[PDB]
Design an enzyme around this catalytic site. Structure first.
Site, PDB file in Angstrom:
ATOM      1  N   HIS A  12       0.630  -1.252   0.115  1.00  0.00           N
ATOM      2  CA  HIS A  12      -0.218   0.069  -0.119  1.00  0.00           C
ATOM      3  C   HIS A  12       0.836   1.338  -0.038  1.00  0.00           C
ATOM      4  O   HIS A  12       0.367   2.387  -0.082  1.00  0.00           O
ATOM      5  CB  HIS A  12      -0.996  -0.109   1.243  1.00  0.00           C
ATOM      6  CG  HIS A  12      -0.560   0.551   2.547  1.00  0.00           C
ATOM      7  ND1 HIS A  12      -0.403  -0.253   3.492  1.00  0.00           N
ATOM      8  CD2 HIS A  12      -0.476   1.658   2.957  1.00  0.00           C
ATOM      9  CE1 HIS A  12      -0.004   0.077   4.810  1.00  0.00           C
ATOM     10  NE2 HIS A  12      -0.083   1.483   4.401  1.00  0.00           N
ATOM     11  N   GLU A  54      19.292   6.638   7.887  1.00  0.00           N
ATOM     12  CA  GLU A  54      18.744   7.993   8.594  1.00  0.00           C
ATOM     13  C   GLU A  54      18.562   8.009   9.955  1.00  0.00           C
ATOM     14  O   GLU A  54      17.954   6.720  10.660  1.00  0.00           O
ATOM     15  CB  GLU A  54      17.253   8.238   7.892  1.00  0.00           C
ATOM     16  CG  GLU A  54      17.577   8.653   6.302  1.00  0.00           C
ATOM     17  CD  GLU A  54      17.638  10.110   6.433  1.00  0.00           C
ATOM     18  OE1 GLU A  54      18.223  10.800   7.343  1.00  0.00           O
ATOM     19  OE2 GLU A  54      17.283  10.951   5.552  1.00  0.00           O
ATOM     20  N   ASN A  71      17.515  11.601  11.968  1.00  0.00           N
ATOM     21  CA  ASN A  71      16.724  12.810  11.638  1.00  0.00           C
ATOM     22  C   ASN A  71      16.485  12.845  10.115  1.00  0.00           C
ATOM     23  O   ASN A  71      17.347  13.376   9.328  1.00  0.00           O
ATOM     24  CB  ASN A  71      17.196  14.025  12.308  1.00  0.00           C
ATOM     25  CG  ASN A  71      16.388  15.100  12.278  1.00  0.00           C
ATOM     26  OD1 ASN A  71      15.576  15.496  11.378  1.00  0.00           O
ATOM     27  ND2 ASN A  71      16.238  15.993  13.373  1.00  0.00           N
ATOM     28  N   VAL A  88      17.480  16.636   8.514  1.00  0.00           N
ATOM     29  CA  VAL A  88      18.591  16.915   8.821  1.00  0.00           C
ATOM     30  C   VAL A  88      19.696  16.126   8.249  1.00  0.00           C
ATOM     31  O   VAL A  88      19.638  14.780   8.521  1.00  0.00           O
ATOM     32  CB  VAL A  88      19.197  17.280  10.213  1.00  0.00           C
ATOM     33  CG1 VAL A  88      20.503  17.629  10.282  1.00  0.00           C
ATOM     34  CG2 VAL A  88      18.121  18.131  10.999  1.00  0.00           C
ATOM     35  N   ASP A  92      -0.029  -7.407   1.677  1.00  0.00           N
ATOM     36  CA  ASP A  92       0.340  -6.061   1.598  1.00  0.00           C
ATOM     37  C   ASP A  92       1.944  -6.203   1.966  1.00  0.00           C
ATOM     38  O   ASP A  92       2.529  -5.933   2.875  1.00  0.00           O
ATOM     39  CB  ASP A  92      -0.379  -5.398   2.842  1.00  0.00           C
ATOM     40  CG  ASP A  92       0.081  -3.920   2.955  1.00  0.00           C
ATOM     41  OD1 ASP A  92       0.680  -3.521   1.899  1.00  0.00           O
ATOM     42  OD2 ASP A  92      -0.244  -3.050   3.827  1.00  0.00           O
ATOM     43  N   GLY A 125       2.300   6.521   8.551  1.00  0.00           N
ATOM     44  CA  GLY A 125       3.524   7.066   8.522  1.00  0.00           C
ATOM     45  C   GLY A 125       4.725   6.038   8.740  1.00  0.00           C
ATOM     46  O   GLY A 125       5.851   5.842   8.525  1.00  0.00           O
ATOM     47  N   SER A 161       3.951   2.753   8.066  1.00  0.00           N
ATOM     48  CA  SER A 161       3.691   1.878   7.102  1.00  0.00           C
ATOM     49  C   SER A 161       4.795   1.481   6.485  1.00  0.00           C
ATOM     50  O   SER A 161       5.509   2.104   6.052  1.00  0.00           O
ATOM     51  CB  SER A 161       2.528   2.105   6.284  1.00  0.00           C
ATOM     52  OG  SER A 161       1.218   2.274   6.977  1.00  0.00           O
ATOM     53  N   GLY A 162       4.731   0.072   6.201  1.00  0.00           N
ATOM     54  CA  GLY A 162       5.863  -0.639   5.432  1.00  0.00           C
ATOM     55  C   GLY A 162       6.987  -0.907   6.314  1.00  0.00           C
ATOM     56  O   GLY A 162       7.962  -1.673   5.707  1.00  0.00           O
TER      57      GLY A 162
END
Ligand SMILES: [Ca+2]
Length: 223
Positions: free
Chosen positions: A40, A52, A54, A57, A84, A175, A177-178
């Site tokens: 999705h 990653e 932040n 930044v 999914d 946010g 998700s995945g």
């Protein structure tokens, strides 16, 4: 992630951010060229962001690599969220190091009661919205399939499991998700869906990665 904690920079070295001008979903690095995410989360024009903490930044450990190909599961159903899962191939191989590292695939499915690590840059509020800049983490157990099915009548397939806390307050959210659910060093889940976030009697629902290992391996072997 609602009710979690700040992971610490690069402490979840398999966590990626999918970026299309902004962070929109998580994913998990499974080898130098491939990421696992939720179907999705599919969109064209993905840049995978590794290393990653932040996401707003440049801190010095990032690798930004465009996707060359995305493969949604053959049987993904966007209405039910069955199957999914998607794979994303990177245009160039990541440079693996202590802060950018793949996560192993399962060899067997996990069991209810196993405590897992769920992570992401999703909403941290269950009523209200606040999106973090740094990566957030939650330790949570897998729930029994019977409790999962009773929480979500008619909705839980054999390709899903629930994890979290029936009392509410701790969950993944929009946010996230995945992104990964890692148990004993193995990627057992992908953040998929839920009713709201962190609601009583409404745990998170996750794609059951162990069902997909054959597909993942064969797809990587011919792409
Ligand atoms: Ca950064």
């Amino acid at each position: 992630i609602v009710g979690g904690y700040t992971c610490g920079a690069n402490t979840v070295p398999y966590q990626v951010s999918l970026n299309s001008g902004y962070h929109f979903c998580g994913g998990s690095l499974i080898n130098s060229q491939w990421v696992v995410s939720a179907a999705h989360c599919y969109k064209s024009g993905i840049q995978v962001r590794l290393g990653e903490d932040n996401i707003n930044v440049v801190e010095g450990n990032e690798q930004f690599i465009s996707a060359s190909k995305s493969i949604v599961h053959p049987s993904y159903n966007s209405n039910t969220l069955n199957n999914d899962i998607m794979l994303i191939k990177l245009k160039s191989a990541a440079s693996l190091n202590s802060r950018v590292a793949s996560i192993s695939l399962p060899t067997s499915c996990a069991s209810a009661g196993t405590q897992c690590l769920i992570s992401g840059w999703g909403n941290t509020k269950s009523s209200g919205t606040s999106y973090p800049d740094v990566l957030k983490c939650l330790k949570a157990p897998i729930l029994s399939d019977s409790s999962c099915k009773s929480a979500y009548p008619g909705q839980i397939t054999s390709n899903m499991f629930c994890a979290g806390y029936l009392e509410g307050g701790k969950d993944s959210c929009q946010g996230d998700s995945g992104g990964p659910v890692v148990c004993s060093g193995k990627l057992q889940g992908i953040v998929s869906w839920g009713s709201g976030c962190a609601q009583k009697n409404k745990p998170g629902v996750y794609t059951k990665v162990c069902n997909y290992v054959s597909w993942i391996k064969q797809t990587i072997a011919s792409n």
